[PDB]
Symmetry: C6
Subunit: 129 residues, 6 copies
């Protein structure tokens, strides 16, 4: 299970620990070679958050915190937290065979990546621009 | 179930609530921030009653006042309404591994997107935009 | 069933209503953005019309009328008629698994697109350069 | 069944009517009008008796007088004959998911294409062309 | 079975002989002669204990003294050891059709490659190279 | 069965007639339009020859003769012999599902291509730069 919590933009997950967050279907992020850091990318079904992701994109409205979480099917073993997020792309599509989905890309000035070991410690990275 | 209702251009859906609109097979649309860059709306349908009218409006650059696109579960949970539409592309194709189909792309000056929530509606979340 | 009737260039269909016309296997056509109108494209097996499509292509010989028809498997629900046609490409290929086929592209100065409703009216478009 | 007979370069077909010609696995050729632009004729065969001769003629730019390509149902229903041929390309390849094979492309100054009709022949329709 | 042991960056393999190293899912590396052009070494692993450290070293341009990559049948038949490594790329991705994974590419100033032969070891064949 | 014998660089085939040569998994070569002659290309599993192909590549060390042979599954029906060979590329990769493999490309100043007919004669080609 994968979830993303976006300040001011609710989704519709019915998970007990992530109520009203966005269920993530796919994601990616990369960093190359002072480094070149790409937009963070996720996919979700078109849902409650969709019209607000579109507005925020179209306006360049800033989002204070975003939190992305991966859970084993129930340890939340990976957490990435982002600051000063800007929604930079919204891509939607559907066909006749599940619901339509949308891919979102966003920028950020800071991040923290926490990985949780087992129950042992935590290993972490962060970055700033 | 997906429908598009285009002013002046009837389709041939036999759905009770969408009689004579166009049944949509697939669609896509995007927006990116380098003012947003907003793509043409794209959809596919079988070649039908609407096709020759769509081809004319395209060839002539003829404006269309209102277009309404709807997805349904049976809740109509997403509606996108576009204003002042111009048909920018008509691509048709068929093969023995079919009915032939056609992709339509179009311009617009404004749009509204409404997502409708329901509980076991409660409400609608909306966005709108204007060139 | 799909058929194309080309002035002066017979095919070998044994259909009762389209005797000696060309059976079409695939086709496409597109129009974009005064519009940009592409060549009309069809595929057929290499047949009686093939050497004449090749000659006409190689010479730039003009063809007065071409008629393309789609039939439900028997209403002829779509008709496209073209004027002043030029054969602009001939592409042939085969393998070991049905017969070889050939793709033909042609230009035209005019067209009429008739769609037939049911039995009701007709809706039509045309264009000229 | 597909055969190519190339002057001076025997293959190893064991077909009765095409003894010692080259069996063809695939081919293609095209012509487009921007004088027509006419592509090299292309075919594939297994690496065989003809291959090292084909490779020599290519390397040397050696002219070949006549090449005859035939498709058969058993009516030989299409024949293309080429004149003054130059081998412009030899690409060979093999893998454990085989016999290795080789694609050959060639130049020509003239060609004739004959399509033979039969009823339950009646005739032939032909085209020819000359650089 | 494939392992990579990276100085200062533990993984979480539970293999007896490679405890706390990184299990590798796929890799690639090449060298071409136009001094040879030598590519970054590339590998993939599941997102694990090593990932945030790998991401830090990348972001900072932090040098890593020794990296050792091993393939095993159970003979460890190929070992490549690299010296003075810099992490040049970190690409991560997940989907519902999974654990997410991550590709890592890295720089190096020297490497040694040993291939170990055995009979029913007898020996090792080696190559080494230095920028 | 496909084999390649490289001067000074042994492989590990256990075939009786090609003991200690390199088992080839795939190969290709092409010649186009004085002709443009590509590098000869073969794939093999990472094996005894691998570290020496890498060294020779990295040094530009010359190899006097290379012999490539194809055998029916046992007539050796095709032989290509190369002179003054240079290893120009080494590309390795593996995954979780047989062993890793490596692709090798090499240059040469001369070659002879012998094809064996049946038992009849031989047909041959060669080239020099």
């Amino acid at each position: 299970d994968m979830f993303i919590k976006i300040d001011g933009i609710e989704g519709e997950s019915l998970d007990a620990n992530h109520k009203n967050e966005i269920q993530v279907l796919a994601w990616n992020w990369d960093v190359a070679q002072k480094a070149s850091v790409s937009d963070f990318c996720f996919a979700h079904y078109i849902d409650k958050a969709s019209p607000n992701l579109l507005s925020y994109c179209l306006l360049g409205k800033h989002i204070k915190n975003v939190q992305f979480v991966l859970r084993k099917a129930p340890l939340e073993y990976l957490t990435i937290k982002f600051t000063d997020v800007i929604i930079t792309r919204v891509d939607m599509a559907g066909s006749l065979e599940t619901r339509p989905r949308e891919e979102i890309r966003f920028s950020f000035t800071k991040m923290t990546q926490d990985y949780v070991m087992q129950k042992s410690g935590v290993i972490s990275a962060n970055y700033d621009v």
